[PDB]
Design a protein around this ligand. Sequence first.
Ligand code: ATP
Ligand code: ATP
Ligand code: ATP
Ligand code: MG
Ligand code: MG
Ligand code: MG
Ligand code: MG
Ligand code: MG
Ligand code: MG
Lengths: 59, 148, 74, 506
Amino acid sequence: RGEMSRAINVFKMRGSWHDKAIREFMISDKGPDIKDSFRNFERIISGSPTRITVDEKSE
Amino acid sequence: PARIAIDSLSALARGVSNNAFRQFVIGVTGYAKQEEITGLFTNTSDQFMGAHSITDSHIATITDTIILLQYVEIRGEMSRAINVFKMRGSWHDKAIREFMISDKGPDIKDSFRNFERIISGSPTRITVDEKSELSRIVRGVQEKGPES
Amino acid sequence: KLRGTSHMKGEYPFTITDHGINIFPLGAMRLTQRSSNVRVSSGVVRLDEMCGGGFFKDSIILATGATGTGKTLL
Amino acid sequence: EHQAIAKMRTMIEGFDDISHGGLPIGRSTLVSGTSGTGKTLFSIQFLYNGIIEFDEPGVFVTFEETPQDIIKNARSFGWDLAKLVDEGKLFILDASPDPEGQEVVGGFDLSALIERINYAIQKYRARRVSIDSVTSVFQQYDASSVVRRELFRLVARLKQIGATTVMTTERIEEYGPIARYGVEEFVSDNVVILRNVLEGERRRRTLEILKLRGTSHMKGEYPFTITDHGINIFPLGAMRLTQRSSNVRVSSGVVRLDEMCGGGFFKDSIILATGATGTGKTLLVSRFVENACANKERAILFAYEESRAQLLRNAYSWGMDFEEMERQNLLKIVCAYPESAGLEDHLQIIKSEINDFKPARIAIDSLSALARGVSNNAFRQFVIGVTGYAKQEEITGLFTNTSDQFMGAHSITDSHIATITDTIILLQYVEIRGEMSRAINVFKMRGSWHDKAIREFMISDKGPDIKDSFRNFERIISGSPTRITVDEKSELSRIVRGVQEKGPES
Ligand SMILES: Nc1ncnc2c1ncn2[C@@H]1O[C@H](COP(=O)(O)OP(=O)(O)OP(=O)(O)O)[C@@H](O)[C@H]1O
Ligand SMILES: Nc1ncnc2c1ncn2[C@@H]1O[C@H](COP(=O)(O)OP(=O)(O)OP(=O)(O)O)[C@@H](O)[C@H]1O
Ligand SMILES: Nc1ncnc2c1ncn2[C@@H]1O[C@H](COP(=O)(O)OP(=O)(O)OP(=O)(O)O)[C@@H](O)[C@H]1O
Ligand SMILES: [Mg+2]
Ligand SMILES: [Mg+2]
Ligand SMILES: [Mg+2]
Ligand SMILES: [Mg+2]
Ligand SMILES: [Mg+2]
Ligand SMILES: [Mg+2]
């Protein structure tokens, strides 16, 4: 929506299992605040997303 | 040995020329084909997602069977996928199947069938009224059958 | 040059080891690689089906993919 | 022939063309070159043929090598010089110093040698003369000044006599000064440089005619090979463009494809099969070779990727038994590594087998296999070679090119050879529904009309199955196509309910 938002992700860890989602986060005076993923978007990695706004199953 | 594996030849190509490498491959490839040895070579394609080539220095062809893993972005998540690209003497599965990674190993689930442009890492979800056609409401031609 | 006869032309890498000079005629080795229809597992069941039975014993299997995909695993 | 300088033939596979005829009669040609380059053979080869082809006795002066050895060595190419030095056709004139020699002797002896050689030439009635390693004579205590005068005397007198002479010169650097005393180059009438350039740990020898006072000739380097038969040159550029073309048609071994090509490949035509790794190329080629033998015609297969054994395993699995093919003496499999020699050689190995077997068809699986390491021009020039040879010989060719980038390769050349080729066959993957399906296409056919669809094909134990086209898909070539449907359910065989039978009975 016209705003440079972030996104943290644990790309690879040889031992552990790590999270496979791309979670956005933000920076305040309290430090980083990881948030929720972009479940509803597409091409996320590319950088310039593309919401899917799928019309449900159309009833 | 009866089996031989070198993890990350892409770890050898470090600095060394392209030709010196290519040669080295043949050197470890041929010697393995003659000595009745089964070999698996690990290669790390410099770029995750989008990779138009599956090697680096173009070793590809000097091989029998290709096994490919590629990151697929889905619903805001980075999930793997595998595919047997080419097998010179066998049949091998054409489909591209995704897979989990736990404490047990690899579980080759299904294939993103309701998807497009997968090889790009970032696919295009395209269910939007699946193979049932606009006839999900069966028109109404089926209003003759049940009577009294 | 080897006056009178023939020879392999060019450079060839050799390694002076604890067993004297050892030259690898990387070009000499011929392309006479015995083959057969024998297959062997991988350690991944389904995967073996995906090949159609298992990798051939006499072959070279290539595993590519981005860092993290899990080639070391396979 | 329009030239004003009379020439005599060396009968050296290649030279007489590059020299537009052969060494200028009554003159001296300086064939110079690095250590082991080819020099002294040329010389010997030059006297040889004159003997065994024109019956012209020759005089060979040795300076460093022992008159015994020259004969001992020349046996490698299969020549009993002995017998000739014996029948009075070849007079070897020793001048090699001695194992218990003094020091100082290269000026008045240079005057004596003239008279010497002048005796044997008058005696044996010779036409050709070789003076191998003059250099060694000055390697006693001399400098540029005394070498141009002394050589000159020798050649000057030699020309007066009427002998067509060849002198040999050594040189430390491959491209730098032509000869040691950087003076021989202007004292001679002609100058034949022989090199053996390194680069990429491999070795490439070439011959070049810098100058031929009086006539024209082919300029620049030309690769040659020293085989069991001696010097062998390739005027890759003297290869005129006047091959024969015919509307005759042959099979591809794949029926449906044939249609797709207007009615079967042209007899005289180069064929290119490009497609990402694992697309199929190797197969087709095998099905091409096969059929050629199924009609009783010869054909060769030069595998640079897969072994002769494996070529059969996968060949049998696809049906078609190569075991028999070999036995019925109809198909010959070469099979080798592109790293086991320089192209010059590889180009000749192929040519050879094409003359000791006379194929009527040929297939080179993975030209791109030969493009490894090598420079594009070097490889492009080699392609023109094979392509060249097979074209002027009515031998149908099917080359295999594997593009370095599956799905998304904006160019099926990579090395840009698609314009020398007559007919291209394209194989490429197609991402349809989480599945890597294949699909072939006939890009171009110079004489035929060929089908313009990008049909899909499947591989079975039986072979290449050419199905139907992805009409309802855009961005095909892109590799991962976009499904846009105007139909699909459109007739073809609607009729719902029970349409099939099963395995019991129909
Ligand atoms: N115990 C585990 N549980 C869940 N996931 C794991 C576990 N171990 C590893 N993984 C996952 O598998 C990946 C490990 O990669 P792996 O060791 O298979 O080699 P690779 O991908 O071929 O090469 P490299 O490790 O150098 O990137 C990690 O990135 C991670 O996502
Ligand atoms: N039968 C043969 N097959 C292949 N190569 C051969 C054969 N016989 C000789 N050669 C090659 O020929 C070359 C010998 O060179 P040659 O005797 O023609 O004179 P030169 O190289 O000009 O001068 P010099 O006496 O200083 O070496 C070597 O490089 C050698 O490998
Ligand atoms: N018996 C078989 N049954 C089914 N499919 C086969 C069989 N043999 C080979 N294949 C298929 O054919 C392909 C093998 O490629 P092929 O040997 O035709 O040469 P290529 O693709 O031109 O070059 P290269 O194999 O060196 O990459 C594989 O990708 C595989 O899917
Ligand atoms: Mg291949
Ligand atoms: Mg890695
Ligand atoms: Mg690793
Ligand atoms: Mg020498
Ligand atoms: Mg010599
Ligand atoms: Mg192949």
